[PDB]
Amino acid sequence: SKSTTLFSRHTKAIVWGMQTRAVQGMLDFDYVCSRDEPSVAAMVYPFTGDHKQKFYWGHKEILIPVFKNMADAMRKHPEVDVLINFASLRSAYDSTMETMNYAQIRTIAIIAEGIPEALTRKLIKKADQKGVTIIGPATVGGIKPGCFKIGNTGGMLDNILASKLYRPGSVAYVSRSGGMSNELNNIISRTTDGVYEGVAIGGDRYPGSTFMDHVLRYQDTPGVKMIVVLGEIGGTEEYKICRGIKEGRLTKPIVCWCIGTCATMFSSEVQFGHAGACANQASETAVAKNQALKEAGVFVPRSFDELGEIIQSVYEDLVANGVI
Amino acid sequence: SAKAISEQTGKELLYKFICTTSAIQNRFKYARVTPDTDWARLLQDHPWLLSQNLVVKPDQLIKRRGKLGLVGVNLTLDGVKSWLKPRLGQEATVGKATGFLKNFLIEPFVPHSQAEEFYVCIYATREGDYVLFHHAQKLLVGVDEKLNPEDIKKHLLVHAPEDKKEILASFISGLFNFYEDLYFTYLEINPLVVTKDGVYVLDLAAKVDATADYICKVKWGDIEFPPPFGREAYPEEAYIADLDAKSGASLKLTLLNPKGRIWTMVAGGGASVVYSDTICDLGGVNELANYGEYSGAPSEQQTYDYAKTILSLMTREKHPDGKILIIGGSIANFTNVAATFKGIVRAIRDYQGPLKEHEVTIFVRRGGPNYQEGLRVMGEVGKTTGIPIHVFGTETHMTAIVGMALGHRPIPENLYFQ
Numbered sequence: 001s002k003s004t005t006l007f008s009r010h011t012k013a014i015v016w017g018m019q020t021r022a023v024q025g026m027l028d029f030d031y032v033c034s035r036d037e038p039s040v041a042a043m044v045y046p047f048t049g050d051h052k053q054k055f056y057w058g059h060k061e062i063l064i065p066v067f068k069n070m071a072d073a074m075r076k077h078p079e080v081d082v083l084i085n086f087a088s089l090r091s092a093y094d095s096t097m098e099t100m101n102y103a104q105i106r107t108i109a110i111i112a113e114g115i116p117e118a119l120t121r122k123l124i125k126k127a128d129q130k131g132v133t134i135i136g137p138a139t140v141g142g143i144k145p146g147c148f149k150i151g152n153t154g155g156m157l158d159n160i161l162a163s164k165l166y167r168p169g170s171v172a173y174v175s176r177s178g179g180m181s182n183e184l185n186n187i188i189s190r191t192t193d194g195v196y197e198g199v200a201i202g203g204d205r206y207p208g209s210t211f212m213d214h215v216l217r218y219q220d221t222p223g224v225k226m227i228v229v230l231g232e233i234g235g236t237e238e239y240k241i242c243r244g245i246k247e248g249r250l251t252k253p254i255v256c257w258c259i260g261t262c263a264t265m266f267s268s269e270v271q272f273g274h275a276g277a278c279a280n281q282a283s284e285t286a287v288a289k290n291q292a293l294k295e296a297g298v299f300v301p302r303s304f305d306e307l308g309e310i311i312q313s314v315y316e317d318l319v320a321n322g323v324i
Numbered sequence: 325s326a327k328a329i330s331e332q333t334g335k336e337l338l339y340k341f342i343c344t345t346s347a348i349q350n351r352f353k354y355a356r357v358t359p360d361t362d363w364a365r366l367l368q369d370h371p372w373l374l375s376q377n378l379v380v381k382p383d384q385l386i387k388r389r390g391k392l393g394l395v396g397v398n399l400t401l402d403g404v405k406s407w408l409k410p411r412l413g414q415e416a417t418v419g420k421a422t423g424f425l426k427n428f429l430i431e432p433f434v435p436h437s438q439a440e441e442f443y444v445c446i447y448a449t450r451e452g453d454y455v456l457f458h459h460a461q462k463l464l465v466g467v468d469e470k471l472n473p474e475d476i477k478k479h480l481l482v483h484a485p486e487d488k489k490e491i492l493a494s495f496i497s498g499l500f501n502f503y504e505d506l507y508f509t510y511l512e513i514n515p516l517v518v519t520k521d522g523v524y525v526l527d528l529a530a531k532v533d534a535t536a537d538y539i540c541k542v543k544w545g546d547i548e549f550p551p552p553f554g555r556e557a558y559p560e561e562a563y564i565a566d567l568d569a570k571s572g573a574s575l576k577l578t579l580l581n582p583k584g585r586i587w588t589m590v591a592g593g594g595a596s597v598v599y600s601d602t603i604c605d606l607g608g609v610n611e612l613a614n615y616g617e618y619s620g621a622p623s624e625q626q627t628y629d630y631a632k633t634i635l636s637l638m639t640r641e642k643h644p645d646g647k648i649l650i651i652g653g654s655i656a657n658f659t660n661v662a663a664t665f666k667g668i669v670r671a672i673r674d675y676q677g678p679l680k681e682h683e684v685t686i687f688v689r690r691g692g693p694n695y696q697e698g699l700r701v702m703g704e705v706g707k708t709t710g711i712p713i714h715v716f717g718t719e720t721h722m723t724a725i726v727g728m729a730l731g732h733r734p735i736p737e738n739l740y741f742q
């Protein structure tokens with residue numbers, strides 16, 4: 001694993017792409033989170049010339065610079081340590097590799113779906129060399145209430161407010177699905193004191209960072225008291241949680257459910273929507289992972305339908321013992 | 325995602341593009357047989373079919389063909405025709421999948437000893453590509469490493485017959501470079517044969533990373549990705565796949581049972597699977613017609629085009645108990661629910677006739693940007709068409725509508741639109 005802490009209420013990011021709606025959405029979040037400053041320092045968009053774009057900080061109109069060249073944005077905004085990459089699948093590899101020539105960048109989000117797995121492996125290799133945390137590809141991103149939200153994650157203000165995403169509770173999560181990450185925002189806000197941090201690792205076969213990369217960050221974060229994982233059929237990554245618990249490395253309660261139990265009932269092989277969501281062996285099915293996690297001490301509900309109930313029971317037990 | 329290719333596709337690419345000091349024999353000496361084959365015309369194109377005995381086997385993404393008794397070995401042409409008579413067109417169950425044997429490959433028999441047979445496999449992991457050799461040796465080739473003949477001799481060919489090390493190493497080096505250049509993720513040759521006359525590829529299975537089409541289209545040409553054995557390929561699936569190709573947004577459709585009475589049109593790669601899980605937990609696996617999803621803020625026109633495909637497909641033949649459509653999703657991050665539900669609502673309008681003939685009941689649950697207006701137009705399209713539509717929002721648990729639609733729980737009217 002790499003850095004325990006990716007974002008804070010001082011995080012400054014560069015957004016690669018002309019994504020004014022996502023940026024303004026980030027600023028709305030920043031505002032109700034009572035951040036001192038917008039989380040977006042600059043955008044990079046090579047299809048336009050240098051310019052400035054109008055956004056709103058509350059009711060006040062502000063200007064955020066847009067740079068044709070990454071080097072100008074980096075040089076002019078040395079406070080930036082996060083880049084969010086909305087480049088199309090065709091150019092996300094090259095713009096991400098280029099980002100990683102800038103030592104100031106410690107975290108990158110890669111949004112695009114459809115990046116070849118062999119290119120992502122090379123991005124992962126370079127990120128691992130440099131200690132850069134990659135979130136994605138093929139992800140909406142993630143959210144750290146009070147601090148920072150990646151792009152479209154969490155949507156508009158009405159949802160930020162309804163799911164209490166403007167201040168951290170005690171529950172951290174990691175999901176393979178972005179849409180379901182926002183459903184977890186909802187479930188957790190209703191059953192606990194709320195999300196402390198959530199990450200959507202994306203649906204590709206080789207995520208830039210895995211379940212266990214973030215689970216470990218959560219184990220090591222004092223403000224986190226329990227951890228929720230939405231796994232999925234395909235690959236073996238969830239077994240690393242079992243191992244982490246067995247080794248005594250993971251000690252906070254973990255609630256996990258793996259989606260894709262239906263595939264055990266189909267007569268033929270089915271590739272689901274996520275590029276990584278296809279079991280190449282019996283161990284990679286959701287049924288197998290769910291059973292293994294349960295046996296290892298993970299709180300596993302009977303099905304998705306009972307996830308909220310087990311989260312709340314674990315949460316209430318932690319309150320009862322003074323942990324929360 | 326990674327998609328299997330037929331043995332014939334893999335061999336065509338291998339024979340065209342592999343660079344090796346080795347002399348590969350029987351290049352392009354294969355013939356495809358279907359139930360529509362004109363055997364005289366087949367023989368005109370492939371005179372070598374008479375020149376020596378033959379091997380015949382299906383080429384349909386069936387694995388372990390030898391251990392299934394599905395390989396006819398060392399046959400004359402008359403022997404092959406006789407071998408095909410009870411197989412060509414027959415049902416076959418392999419594992420738990422059932423399909424028709426419809427595509428077969430004929431190739432020359434190569435006489436050889438067991439000690440001239442070798443196993444080679446390359447497969448992708450996170451940490452790089454493992455190369456397997458057996459006469460077992462296995463080597464991880466890291467993401468930035470080359471695989472030279474001397475690396476193969478050193479790490480993999482320890483036990484190989486001394487007089488075959490040079491040609492094996494040359495072949496496997498070229499094979500690995502071909503694996504990388506054409507964006508393979510899995511390539512197995514079982515067996516590779518090396519006799520005094522050179523190298524023979526008797527067998528091949530492979531997957532390529534289909535997302536690399538924009539890099540590889542020149543080499544791949546018009547490459548075919550067949551469905552897995554046990555399913556058919558349908559034109560509606562190809563229509564959606566072509567839409568999916570044209571946009572950042574994700575549009576996916578897989579037909580599981582075209583006669584099934586339970587259809588889904590769910591937003592999100594995650595939620596679609598959860599809805600599908602729930603349907604099967606409640607006993608509906610044999611009536612689930614499809615898996616698919618839309619996600620990533622598709623336009624209203626994209627959703628309409630997706631929806632009209634579904635609605636077309638569920639109004640082909642009637643079902644005694646009517647049909648259900650599950651229009652579900654999470655609370656979306658940024659997909660515009662009003663724009664997308666307006667597209668679905670317009671498809672429903674255009675199909676309201678068929679949808680009433682087939683006794684369709686629609687259940688909706690969705691949150692997200694503008695979801696309140698999306699839920700309203702769904703409610704309005706039901707009232708204006710006669711189609712029963714039950715509409716729920718963020719205050720209903722995501723999957724509760726599955727239990728409702730299959731009769732396991734009552735419909736709570738006190739939750740409509742919230």
Ligand SMILES: O=C(O)C[C@@](O)(C(=O)O)[C@H](O)C(=O)O
Nearest residue numbers: 179591619620656657658659
């Ligand atoms: O519409 C959905 O339910 C999925 C999604 O598009 C969203 O807006 O939440 C998700 O962010 C994704 O990008 O797949």
